[PDB]
Amino acid sequence: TLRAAVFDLDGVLALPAVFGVLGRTEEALALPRGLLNDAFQKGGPEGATTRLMKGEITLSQWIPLMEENCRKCSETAKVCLPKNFSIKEIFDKAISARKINRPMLQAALMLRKKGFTTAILTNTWLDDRAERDGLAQLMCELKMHFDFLIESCQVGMVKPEPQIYKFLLDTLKASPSEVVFLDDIGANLKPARDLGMVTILVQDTDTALKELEKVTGIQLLNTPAPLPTSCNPSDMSHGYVTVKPRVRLHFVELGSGPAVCLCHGFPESWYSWRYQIPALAQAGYRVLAMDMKGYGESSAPPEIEEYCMEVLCKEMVTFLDKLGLSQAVFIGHDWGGMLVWYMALFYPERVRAVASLNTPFIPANPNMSPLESIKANPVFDYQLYFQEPGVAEAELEQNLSRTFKSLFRASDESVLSMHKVCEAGGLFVNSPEEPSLSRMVTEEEIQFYVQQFKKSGFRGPLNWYRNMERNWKWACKSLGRKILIPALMVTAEKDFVLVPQMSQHMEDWIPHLKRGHIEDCGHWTQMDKPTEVNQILIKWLDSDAR
Amino acid sequence: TLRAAVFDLDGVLALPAVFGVLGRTEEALALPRGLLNDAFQKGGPEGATTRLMKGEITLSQWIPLMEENCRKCSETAKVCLPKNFSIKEIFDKAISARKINRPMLQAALMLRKKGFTTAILTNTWLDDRAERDGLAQLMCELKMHFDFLIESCQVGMVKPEPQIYKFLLDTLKASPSEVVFLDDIGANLKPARDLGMVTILVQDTDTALKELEKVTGIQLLNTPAPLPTSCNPSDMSHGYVTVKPRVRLHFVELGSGPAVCLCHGFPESWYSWRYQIPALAQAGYRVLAMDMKGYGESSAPPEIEEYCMEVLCKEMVTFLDKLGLSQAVFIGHDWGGMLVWYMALFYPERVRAVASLNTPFIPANPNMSPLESIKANPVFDYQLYFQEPGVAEAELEQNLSRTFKSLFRASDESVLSMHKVCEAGGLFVNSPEEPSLSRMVTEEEIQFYVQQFKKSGFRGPLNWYRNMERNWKWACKSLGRKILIPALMVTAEKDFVLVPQMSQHMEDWIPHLKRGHIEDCGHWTQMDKPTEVNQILIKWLDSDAR
Ligand SMILES: C[C@@H](NC(=O)Nc1ccccc1)C1CC1
């Protein structure tokens, strides 16, 4: 029956409420109880505050009017305002104080996940203060989770006037009894109730959500930890840079602040970072999530040598040059992780800091051809299978959905064994035709990978494995160097290809290396444990890249 | 005969040289003359410094080796080094001291403009210092002006070894007598001379350029002020954001630092900002140069109301939301200038600061329909001509090259009179079939506009003029507000459509407005006086947006 949920902002989605601060201010300052609320509300529907809220005047213009109402109220109460009483002051403080009420936001998210239309309905103002950005960020973070954000000052109407409710209902394409509205001001709920809406008066958060659970039939309190926010491909800014005549790089870009270039592995996509991209932007970074060369919407030329590490690296430097970035933080996973260590070794002037998920840094052995080195380890047998051009492309392109559903599996989900793959004759020879769906991915997310890899197939991607000798000779040039820029190695307990123990000597070559470790995490680190990756990257970025 | 010019970096393209600082340091510190040069050069071809320069070790690894050579040199000279002697210290200082030698850079540019292949040949290092970024920026600014930058530490070879010259000649696809090379170290010039190259020993800049003029036959000294750097479309990062189902915005993006969104006028392109984009990036800004809705690679839906200011503004806010920007600086010219004032009035929380070229802010008159207001002024008669859908599109699309060559004209070049255009029956009725080329634009640059406007024509662009009443009613909502965020109005003396006097009352509504004025500048401000625009925007950005 209910099909829409509407949340107030102040005191409902954001806490503390700012009425809360006027109360505290009178007390803290020993003024007559309610005096600041009297100035604030002075003149009711024609007073300064309603003009603010309807968008007629800005917040900076309203400030000196509140001053005057503050004076008039105190003269009529026969008291004085303190020396250096400051309205600007009180409001800035109140506004930077208010944060997102996480449990209310998560209830709004879940309700939207079960198909409610959701909105924010707020009396707010046109903010032209020097410090306006704080609230702009908060409004940005909140709004992306809702169907509509309706602000009094943008629509020229204010709660509790009945016209804003009619605007609300008309925006929601829903009738009043399909609607639940939560607000902390009962006056605000009166007109809503009159049209026949379910309303909930919000004091303490938990009782509100109890009423909201009871009325919607949906579990909202005590629910498990939800996943971080993901990305919808068609809502992203997509960028394209030509690095040389045949070769463009595509990337997805979100956020502002220091550039953070994310480099995915095999056989993956910018979309492998879907859980990190919104968190890192939200943490104050400019995220660039690449399609690496060979993939997705980046160019995939056929020739093997277009994918040696030397060339891949030079082209990532060109990518920075054309975008006008003197540096970026480079964060890589799997093959992208190998690339970022090489960026650190050959272009340290261009890398602000370097982090790898799963891929360790192990210096080339100048006394052993890499083919040799490969044979002395059963787990890398599958790389020999990748060598012969055409062979692995035929198996991996033969059925895309089966390819990704077989690869992308959590550590307890019957991961593909990477074992005597040549002897067996292929990677999938012992896996079902129709694998079940991993818990890590939806069927939609698999079909995004399928659709990406329909553009170029597996030739480019496989070519990354086909420059063993050439990469070896290049890496040998770097054997006298150490990596002395800020560096993070994140190991994944149950990645059985890139095992944590393989990273154990990195401090010999990266003396100030920092570390994280994710337990119970297989090879697909970003989507296996997105919450922990986010926390480890953001904490390292804030201390070492900022 | 000469077809290539090669410039050293230290002491040639960048000044002061760092050998210069070792000299000063000995003196300043009263050490034995040349001692620091002895430590630096210690061991010659096998010493620490040559290993640095060949890329074998990084700058941070070399630092403590120079220390040791500094010690060994002083013990053998029978002196002491001062307390807190610091190599790191001396080099950081020396490196942040060196700037681009502007006159040498401009000679390299001109020589490249007359078709020389140009390069930088430098003994330099892999820089992993905390402060590495300073030099990375300098290297970035220099490199975009040259065909090749060859660094000793990236190629594993050093001047004066003869192999680096052979690598040079092979990179240039030229023989030794087609080559001029300038360096401040004569030892560096010896091997070049042996292969038969013209060489020039660089002490003072002017004598070097005198020798360079004499040898190339090209005037390089005392030449006029060159234009700022422009943009080549296919070297840019191109971005695309979908703001609603039918509508994407394209933009060109360059630089890092605070977001600066550039909004062009009618009938223009992101490319109208080609002279500002590199300067603003170089000044430490993240430039986003839009195709505005209707233009270029942005969507151009047909319906008139898709181009009212309300909708254009909401969609620019969506553009920010999807890119994850809580704010941008908005800088507009002509119609884009009108839009940025409206962004400031309806979304001040999203605009860090606002600047307009030519377009004044004049509050809507709530007592006079805008058609009326239009008739009471002969210069805006041409807007009536724009009203009737189809009419102006036919004239403006009929011959594109003639359209832009007729519009884009400096103030002394027979600008189109915007006079009784309806009565005359069109905008070009009294202009030639084949206009000459304005000094402001090359024939290539005109053909870029032609090719852009072949995608969608003039319907979208003209539609911006077709929402007079709707924009009026919207703007009337804003009549109680003032614009109280940082704001800049730049007037153009000889713009006879948007005259400077039209802006004279802006302080009544924008009390802290800042100003610039460009004399001898017609309507196409960015390309008429690109040098002065750059200087005025960068100075306002650095003081008011930073
Ligand atoms: C060793 C290699 N990673 C790798 O093969 N992952 C992989 C293997 C099989 C299937 C999917 C991914 C690159 C150097 C880091």
Ligand SMILES: C[C@@H](NC(=O)Nc1ccccc1)C1CC1
């Ligand atoms: C008045 C209008 N500018 C305008 O028509 N420029 C123009 C006129 C004719 C040809 C090219 C450009 C917009 C509001 C600022």
Ligand SMILES: [Mg+2]
């Ligand atoms: Mg409230």
Ligand SMILES: [Mg+2]
């Ligand atoms: Mg030199």
